Amino acid sequence: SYDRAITVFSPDGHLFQVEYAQEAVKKGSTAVGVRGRDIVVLGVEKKSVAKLQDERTVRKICALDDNVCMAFAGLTADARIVINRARVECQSHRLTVEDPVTVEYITRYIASLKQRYTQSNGRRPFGISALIVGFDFDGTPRLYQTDPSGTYHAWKANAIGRGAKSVREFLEKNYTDEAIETDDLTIKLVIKALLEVVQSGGKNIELAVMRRDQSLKILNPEEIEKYVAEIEKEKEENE
Amino acid sequence: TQNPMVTGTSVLGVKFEGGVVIAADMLGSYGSLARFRNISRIMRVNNSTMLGASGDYADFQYLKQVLGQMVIDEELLGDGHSYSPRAIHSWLTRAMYSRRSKMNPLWNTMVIGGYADGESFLGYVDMLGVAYEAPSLATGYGAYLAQPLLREVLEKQPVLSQTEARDLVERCMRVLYYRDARSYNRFQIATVTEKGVEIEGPLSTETNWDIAHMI
Amino acid sequence: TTTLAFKFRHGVIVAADSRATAGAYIASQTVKKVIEINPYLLGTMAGGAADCSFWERLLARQCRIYELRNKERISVAAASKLLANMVYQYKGMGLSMGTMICGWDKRGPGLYYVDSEGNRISGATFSVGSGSVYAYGVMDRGYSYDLEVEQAYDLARRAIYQATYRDAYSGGAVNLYHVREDGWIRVSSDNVADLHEKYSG
Amino acid sequence: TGYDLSASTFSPDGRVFQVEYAMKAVENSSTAIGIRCKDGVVFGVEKLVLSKLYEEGSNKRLFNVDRHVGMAVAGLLADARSLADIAREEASNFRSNFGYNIPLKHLADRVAMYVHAYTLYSAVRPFGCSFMLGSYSVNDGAQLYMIDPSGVSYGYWGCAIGKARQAAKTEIEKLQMKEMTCRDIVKEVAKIIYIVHDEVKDKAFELELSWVGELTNGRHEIVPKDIREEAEKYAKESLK
Amino acid sequence: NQYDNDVTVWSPQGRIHQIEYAMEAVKQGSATVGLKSKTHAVLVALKRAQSELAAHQKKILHVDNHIGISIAGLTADARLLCNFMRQECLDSRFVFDRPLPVSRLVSLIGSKTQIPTQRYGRRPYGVGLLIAGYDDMGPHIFQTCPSANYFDCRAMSIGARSQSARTYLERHMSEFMECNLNELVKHGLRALRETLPAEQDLTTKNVSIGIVGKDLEFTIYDDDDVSPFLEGLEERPQ
């Protein structure tokens, strides 16, 4: 071996570049996502406004279908390509199969594309890791994650990007089975996760939800402001 | 070939005791005009098998070329192994079938005669790939005319001698000279035994016309 | 050749004859026309033997692959759609195929109708074959939604009897399959002459 | 000493070391000679049994390309087998396209171009073979050519390929080669091969002799060497 | 040592060492022995296992009605050349409607393995073929090599520690030609019992025998038509 190229095993049995293309994901912006029982929720941090532009084009949360939602980390160009191919693939699934697209299908497609992309000669691995949240079969909320290796892996909540161990540790130290959702608890759980963000500046918070029958709703950072205020009120009630 | 330009005519072949005799004539008629009245329509393959054909003569030249090259190749292998005549028959059948599958048939009618390892062989190959074995073969109008003489004597006597076989071939070719319009009084007889392959010269027929003095 | 299909309160009824001629000559009397695709799908044979048999076997292949990849059994409309899309790629090259697709769904009953001309349509009653018009007649006499089970059995059986009685290209054993909520169940295989003695009076 | 890796690159003094290394690859191979007479060409190969595991009649380096052409290869054996198949194919194209026997000059030039085409590019290596080509024709006489690993192909009366390349042609050239028919040349080649390396480094060798000319009426085949047995009853008289 | 990397590179001594390395890769298989009489050709191989509980990796495999091969070395290339072997047999069985003579088949094998020994991008096939067959001129025992310099013998043995087998074949190659099947097969395993270290004995489950005959179709044997073959022996001269 060496860190060159993607095809050689290590002398102790690793692929260097799979572990190494995860590092670019590990060094990206944070985005979390949970499932409530009826409403699914996710959101990104780090709006990072540079005082002189628009930001409606830099949106890290998009959709492929009327049922499914996106997120990513890592570098954004691979996200743009994968999202472009995912739209085409989701529509081609809609072409033959007349269903609303199951989330498991589009995650298998993304991971399969990612792995057959990684196997080949000198194609640079996609340095992203997506979050694919949706609720199709009887409105059952699901969220899967990806990896530069190409392993779709179903969870109930998630944290990626920079310092994701602390954020997932907050979902570990919070995550109550009770009750239920209760969309209010899911909203407050998003509020606690975004308060538990790596920075939590209060204005760099961007969150979007889906109530498993509607479409994506982009919020307004005053409802979130009153959410942060009542989180601070409950924190005062702790004293 | 869709339209046969220069056709041959009927080929006769019959086994006998330890050998096969084949005789075909030497005419290259185009339409009704007998344009090529001295040509050879039998290839003497290496030492055992032997080929005679009908239909388009150019295709016969082509198969002569290809078979000659294959026989030369196996003899240049130097292994002491040859093609059995039945293998040649199989190869030619597969060749014609793969030819006609592409809707470009070889307009031919081929007869393969061989003697190897004590046993005689006499095979047939059609244009359509229809292929079988027989104690006596007859192509073109020979299957209409000289076939019942062969099947008469073979029913009355299943085996033959070389002299009787050659005489019967002479009589059948006499009859074919009598009433085939595409026929000619010049033919060559080719014979295989264990002693090798032999091509006899351009023989002829002895005819009768004593019915013409009647009205 | 005469097939029909109709769904009702208690599932779907499918019946067919078993005569398959060759020109003016009858080849067989026991051609099982309703091709058993799955333990939850039933396909038929409606115009042409080889085309219907081959393409439905390939559809069964595709359905088993779909279930083993998604861990969830395919719907009916998806299967009919896959069959129509696969048949459509040889349009004009001379495929004759007029089968029907039946099965149970998450939505419940499912009944589609796929041609080699690609007329993929849903519906409630269908009938295919040379003597299909006779079946349409007697079926649209006896059709309702609130029928019983043995009533629907008698309706379909009487229907195939009338169809084979008038048409010349039909006869043989009367198959009769019944699709339930869990899976399909063969009801009976009745000969024509037994029905003639029983229903002639 | 370089710069010896690719077959495309040159040296600071201007030659390809791949071709040189392939030329001296055949130097370790068995000694194979050839010589023509005024009505034929005679081949002869010093062939060695490994120890006792052979069958005396396997893997004969005297090939037979066309009805009147055969090879007398020396070097890497499988590469020579492939080259012999290429030569059979080229004679096949000529026989199929022109209806008569290939002239030996044109065949040798096509084969030399084929060998040169394997010396050109960097994906492939040069051949590790060096072989002989004989023929006979009624309107052409006897022709003996010679192909190196590089692809230089021209003609000889006699040649030798193997270890004793010099040590055979030292006494090949003292033959009165024109005035002899090949039936003398048979025992001549027998005595020449029998001179070199009786027992010194190896234990035992064995003789094969190919044979083309007017006496075969234009055919090319191995001699009936057992008939007239001309080596040994003269080889035992060649030790004194 | 920097020229000793690829197939394409000639050495400055002219010996492409990748061929030598493939030879040594052939040398690390199991032992196997092939030998012929005038009328019957017998090849006997030796099995090995990964553990006690596992089955033994088989070596003698079928090819055709009169062709069967032994093997040593890699197994992916073994099945690749197996598929090529079966394919080329049934091809001429289709076209010419005859069984193939063996020499032209092994020439096709050499011509097959020539291309991965000269261009760049494929490795030479680590392979240990011992081929038994019947053309019109009797039984044949051919062997191959990764250099495609296929040999014909009357008795060979390739693999690990196969040289004592070769000594046995040398001191019985005069005796081989006359005998019938039974003592021939026990000569074969009186080579294999010297392909083994002396502190253990050849059992049933580790040996395999394949006979092809001039009237006998090629047949592989394992433990049950080998229990007849395993009796009729004495111990080694300890």
Add this chain to the structure above:
Amino acid sequence: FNGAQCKAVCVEAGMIALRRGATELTHEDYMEGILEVQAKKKANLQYYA
């Protein structure tokens, strides 16, 4: 290999025979002498079936 390494093959073949206490040598004693002169082998073996 040189002269000294072949002498080492001789001595290591003697010692490898002495591991089983053999009275006279054998051929694979020499072969394991070749392997141990180089570095060693076992063989492990696999992929050679």
Add this chain to the structure above:
Amino acid sequence: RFSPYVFNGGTILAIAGEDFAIVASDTRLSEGFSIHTRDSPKCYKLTDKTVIGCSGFHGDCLTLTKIIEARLKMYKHSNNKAMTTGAIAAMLSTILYSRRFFPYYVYNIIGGLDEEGKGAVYSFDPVGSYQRDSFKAGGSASAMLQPLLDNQVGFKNMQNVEHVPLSLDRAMRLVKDVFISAAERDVYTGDALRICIVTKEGIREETVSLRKD
């Protein structure tokens, strides 16, 4: 012009017994109003328990026989066991549809034993359907042979006639009589009869002549 098909004719019969499958066929190969031979057996012994007969265009019959033999050897050399009968039937159906858009002009009847050791006859069509029936007659004498087998094997259209299982020698005398009766009215039937019998112990053959015209 060139016509790609020609009608060679022929007659193949099969009878599925309790533990036996008898396949018989004439050996006349003709064309139009001529006779090419009086020995060309339509029967072929595939395995120890499978016999196939092939009529129609003769060259396609030969080609199909060779392809089936090749795939039989491929299945054996891949999976260490011979095929069943129904597996061969399915494979033949896949082949006959794999040349759908330029069909074989071949009627096909496969007889043989199942895995329970009972008779099974799988008929065919030129395009690739099949079914497990007890008796079929393919070729020129199809219509001359089906109603008599309906009378005897099926016991159809009869009254107060009980059903006796079909024995062996009863089937043999049936086959001999039906080939005589069909050779009386057909022009594509006669000069020999090659009867193949598949038991649980192998394949038997039997040669019965006919009228020589």
Add this chain to the structure above:
Amino acid sequence: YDRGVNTFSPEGRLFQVEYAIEAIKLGSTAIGIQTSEGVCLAVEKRITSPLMEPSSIEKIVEIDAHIGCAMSGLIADAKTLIDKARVETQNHWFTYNETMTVESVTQAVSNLALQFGEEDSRPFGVALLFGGVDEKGPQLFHMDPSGTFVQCDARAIGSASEGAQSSLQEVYHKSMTLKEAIKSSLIILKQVMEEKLNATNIELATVQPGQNFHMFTKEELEEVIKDI
């Protein structure tokens, strides 16, 4: 050096294959056991998170109605091979109306276990355990990345497979029963795992000739674990 799938060693060998056999060792353990009563099989999941939903991690997948499987090491090479095995067994049933036997399945897989070639892609990094019930009864099968496929009576894979084999050779013989083999496997499991054995760690997969369908045990596995 050794660098590359197209270069031998001075003594052998690859050195790409060897690094793949090295790459086996990192995976989770699994144990499959042949018994004439039927083939049983077990695995450890190594669940990381409580959010890590346990039924989504696949180890035992379904090839046929009577042919099970287990994977090792790399996940996605296993996903490719499982997909292909499903497709090709379905192809066998297509052209033959019958079940492709397990040896023929694994021959069909190891036809391209090593078809690795990037020109004229990499070798795969997964060990597979195959169980099924052919006409010859139950079968237990073990392949490797190098395609060197063999039958095994009771094979253990992946991490800590040596002591698994040793303590397996302690307990195994030819005439074992089913339930004894099940508990004999899970004893070895909770000797080679690190955490406490409970309902969510391991999963069983048993196939019987009379119970061809449902090669799985679902939360009666709880009842089996509490019997130790």
